[PDB]
Design an enzyme around this catalytic site. Sequence first.
Site, mmCIF file in Angstrom:
data_model
loop_
_atom_site.group_PDB
_atom_site.id
_atom_site.type_symbol
_atom_site.label_atom_id
_atom_site.label_comp_id
_atom_site.label_asym_id
_atom_site.label_seq_id
_atom_site.Cartn_x
_atom_site.Cartn_y
_atom_site.Cartn_z
ATOM 1 N N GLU A 96 -0.829 3.838 2.266
ATOM 2 C CA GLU A 96 -2.201 4.253 1.934
ATOM 3 C C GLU A 96 -2.531 5.607 2.588
ATOM 4 O O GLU A 96 -1.844 6.009 3.523
ATOM 5 C CB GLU A 96 -3.199 3.152 2.329
ATOM 6 C CG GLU A 96 -4.344 3.595 3.234
ATOM 7 C CD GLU A 96 -4.026 3.458 4.715
ATOM 8 O OE1 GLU A 96 -4.215 4.439 5.470
ATOM 9 O OE2 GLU A 96 -3.611 2.358 5.132
ATOM 10 N N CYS A 112 8.799 -0.259 -14.613
ATOM 11 C CA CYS A 112 8.896 0.735 -15.687
ATOM 12 C C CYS A 112 7.785 0.685 -16.715
ATOM 13 O O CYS A 112 7.740 1.534 -17.595
ATOM 14 C CB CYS A 112 10.227 0.606 -16.430
ATOM 15 S SG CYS A 112 11.541 1.508 -15.607
HETATM 16 C C1 CER Z 1 -17.571 3.769 8.257
HETATM 17 C C2 CER Z 1 -16.390 4.163 7.396
HETATM 18 C C3 CER Z 1 -15.167 3.672 7.681
HETATM 19 C C4 CER Z 1 -14.769 2.305 7.167
HETATM 20 C C5 CER Z 1 -13.450 2.407 6.431
HETATM 21 C C6 CER Z 1 -12.361 1.766 6.905
HETATM 22 C C7 CER Z 1 -11.315 2.532 7.690
HETATM 23 C C8 CER Z 1 -10.475 1.600 8.546
HETATM 24 C C9 CER Z 1 -9.693 0.646 7.669
HETATM 25 O O1 CER Z 1 -9.857 -0.557 7.724
HETATM 26 C C10 CER Z 1 -8.813 1.200 6.594
HETATM 27 O O2 CER Z 1 -7.564 0.548 6.598
HETATM 28 C C11 CER Z 1 -9.539 0.926 5.307
HETATM 29 C C12 CER Z 1 -8.694 1.436 4.185
HETATM 30 N N1 CER Z 1 -7.335 1.779 4.422
HETATM 31 O O3 CER Z 1 -9.209 1.582 3.100
HETATM 32 C C1 CER Z 2 17.677 -4.661 -21.996
HETATM 33 C C2 CER Z 2 16.792 -4.982 -20.810
HETATM 34 C C3 CER Z 2 16.818 -4.181 -19.726
HETATM 35 C C4 CER Z 2 15.975 -2.924 -19.701
HETATM 36 C C5 CER Z 2 15.131 -2.908 -18.443
HETATM 37 C C6 CER Z 2 15.323 -1.950 -17.514
HETATM 38 C C7 CER Z 2 16.130 -2.256 -16.267
HETATM 39 C C8 CER Z 2 16.657 -0.985 -15.625
HETATM 40 C C9 CER Z 2 15.508 -0.123 -15.151
HETATM 41 O O1 CER Z 2 15.317 0.993 -15.595
HETATM 42 C C10 CER Z 2 14.486 -0.712 -14.232
HETATM 43 O O2 CER Z 2 14.202 0.180 -13.178
HETATM 44 C C11 CER Z 2 13.263 -0.921 -15.081
HETATM 45 C C12 CER Z 2 12.191 -1.487 -14.209
HETATM 46 N N1 CER Z 2 12.338 -1.457 -12.795
HETATM 47 O O3 CER Z 2 11.231 -1.999 -14.739
#
Ligand code: CER
Ligand code: CER
EC number: 2.3.3.20
Lengths: 331, 331
Positions: free
Chosen positions: B104, B130
Site C-alpha cells: 500500500e 490475467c
Molecule cells: C487522521 C488520518 C489518518 C488516518 C489514516 C490511517 C493511517 C494509518 C493506517 O491505519 C493506514 O494503514 C491506513 C491505510 N493504509 O489506509
Molecule cells: C488453456 C488454458 C490456459 C490459459 C491460461 C493462462 C495460464 C498462463 C498464464 O498466462 C497465467 O499467468 C494466466 C493467469 N495468471 O491468469
Amino acid sequence: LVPRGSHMLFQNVSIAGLAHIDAPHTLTSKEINERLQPTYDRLGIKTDVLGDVAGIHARRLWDQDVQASDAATQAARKALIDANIGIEKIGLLINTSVSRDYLEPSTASIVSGNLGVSDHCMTFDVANACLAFINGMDIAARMLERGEIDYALVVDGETANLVYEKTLERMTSPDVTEEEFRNELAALTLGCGAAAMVMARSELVPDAPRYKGGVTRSATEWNRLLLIEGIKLAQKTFVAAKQVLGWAVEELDQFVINQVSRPHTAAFVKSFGIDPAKVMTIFGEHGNIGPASVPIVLSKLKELGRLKKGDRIALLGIGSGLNCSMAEVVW
Amino acid sequence: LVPRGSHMLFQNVSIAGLAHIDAPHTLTSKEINERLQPTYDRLGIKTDVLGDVAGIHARRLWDQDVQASDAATQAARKALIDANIGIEKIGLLINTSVSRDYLEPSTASIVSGNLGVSDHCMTFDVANACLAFINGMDIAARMLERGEIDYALVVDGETANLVYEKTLERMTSPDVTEEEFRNELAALTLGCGAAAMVMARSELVPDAPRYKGGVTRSATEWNRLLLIEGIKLAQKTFVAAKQVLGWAVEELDQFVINQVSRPHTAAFVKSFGIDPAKVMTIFGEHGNIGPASVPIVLSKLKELGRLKKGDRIALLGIGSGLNCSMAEVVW
Ligand SMILES: C/C=C\C/C=C/CCC(=O)[C@@H](O)CC(N)=O
Ligand SMILES: C/C=C\C/C=C/CCC(=O)[C@@H](O)CC(N)=O
Ligand SMILES: [Mn+2]
Ligand SMILES: [Mn+2]
C-alpha cells in the site's frame, strides 16, 4: 431528469449476515518494550512510543501460520451461518485484505475454492489500503441493485505475525539508526483478525439492515502531516456526504471508524465535534486491523446488542492514498 | 418482468480512448538459452523448452527500473490523448496489473497522483491474474451505466525485469534440481508492457465503439492439466455467452485472447473451430504480458487499421483461479 443526491443511493441492497474472528494470541506492548528496552537505551529514547504516543496496550496475533485466505474463509463460514444460507446462493465473492497469499491467483479464488462456490460465482480481489472493505461493499451493491446477482460475500483476513518477526529483529540490531527505528516502529501497531459480510437484495431478506451507499474523496497529491491532511480530506468528504446522504453529525447514532491510534481518533472526534460515546474503539487491545477494522467493529456492535432497528450508522475510513470514504447503514 | 440475457448488457457505455506501450528492450530466447546452456547440459535436457515447447522467440523488457505505476501512467497519458480529454474529466481510475509498487498505497492512487486527478476521482486496484483488465472494464461500466461518473480510466503496467534476474540466476546454480528447474522455467515466458483505456457514457462520445459487457464462469476447485481444464471452463463460459450475448463463433470478427503459449493458443482455436486468422497473436515476440495482453492486442488492432464500424470483437481470458471471462465490443 433533475439529479439529486438521494438518486445515486442504493434502494434494494441489504446486509444479510456479518461475522468477525478475533485472533487468539494477546501480545502486550509491555512485553514488546522489554524486548526493545536495550535498543531504547542505545539510541537513548525514554519515551514509550507504543504505550504513550500511540496508546496501544496490546494487539492480537494468530497462534499458527495462518494465511490471509485461511482467516477470511473462517469468517466467511460464520457469516453464512449468520445469514442462514448456503454457499450455493453466492454469486460474487470479493476479497479486500491488504495481506495476500500470492501475486496470483487472487486470494478471492482461494477462499472461493475452500468454501465450494458454484461455477457461476464471480471472484476477484480489491486493494485500497484501509478503505477496501467499503469499496468491496459498493462494488457488490451495484451488481445486486442491477439484479445481476442475489447474494454476495465480501471477506477480509489480516495477518501480521511475519511483519512483526522481521521488524522486531531489525529493531534490535546494533546497526539501526533513529530515522530507521522510528519508521519501523509503526509496524508494531498492526493487529490480526478477520471479517466477512453477506449482502443481498432487500426483497430476499425483508427487514434486514439496509446499505444505502456513500461517497469518496481523494487527495492523491499526497500519495504530524498525514494527520492534518487526513482531517482536511475527511471534512471535505463530510460535505459530499451531506450533499448525497443528507448527514448531520447529531442525527447519526454510531460512527464506525477505521482504527488507528489514540491521537488520530482524538483529533478526528474533536475536529467534527462527535460524542466519543458514539465511536466504539478497539485499537488499544487489538491494534490496527487495516481494512478489516470497520466490519469487525460493526460485528462487535451487533453482537453486544448495541444496535437497534432504525439506527443510522456511519461507516468511515481515511486511508493511504490519500482517500476517504463514508457510507451509511440503516439498521 | 421476464428476464432475458440481453437485459443485463450495458446500453450506454463506450470506449473513448485506447493506447498501449511496447517495452523497448528485445531479449531473444536464443540469448537466454546460451546463458542456460551449461545447466541444460548438467541436468541433460536436449529439448529447447522455450523456443520449441512454448514457441517464444523473444520478449520485451524495460531498459531501466520502471515501476508498474510508471508504465501505467505512460499508457494513461496516451489514452487521454487518444480520447481528446483532460484528466479533470476522470471520475474513476482502476489499476488492474499483477505487478504492484507496494502492499500500500494502491498502485491506482500513485498513478492518479502522477496524472493529477481531481479530488472527486475514486481510485482502487483490482487483482485477478490475467482477467483483471476485463474485470476493471466491467466495474467501471456499472458506474457509467448508472450515471455515477461520465469518464473512467482503466490502466495496467507490467514489469518482469526483476523476476528474470532472480530466476535466471537460480536456473544457473549448481544446487538446482529438475522439478525445480522445470517449474522456474515458466517464469521466462513473461513479458513487459502497458495499456490504458478511457471509457465513457455513450452520449458523450457519439459513435465511439460500444462495450456491451459479458459473462464469467469459474472452476475454483482447481485453484497438461491446466490446459485441459482451461478449455473445459472456456467451453462452459461460451455457453453462458451464447445465452447472454447471443454469440456464434462464425458471427464474430476478431478474438482478442490473453496471450500465453503457442500450444495453449493452438488447443484453444482447434477446440472451438476458430479461423486462426481472426486471432491476432503477440506471444512469440512479446511473451505473456498477463492482464495487459488483451487491451494491448486490441490497441494494436485499432492502430493497424484492422477494425471497422460494426465489427464484433470478442475479448476473452482464461486465468488462474481458474476463472474465465468473455465480453463483447462492437467497434
Ligand atoms: C487522521 C488520518 C489518518 C488516518 C489514516 C490511517 C493511517 C494509518 C493506517 O491505519 C493506514 O494503514 C491506513 C491505510 N493504509 O489506509
Ligand atoms: C488453456 C488454458 C490456459 C490459459 C491460461 C493462462 C495460464 C498462463 C498464464 O498466462 C497465467 O499467468 C494466466 C493467469 N495468471 O491468469
Ligand atoms: Mn497463544
Ligand atoms: Mn535496450
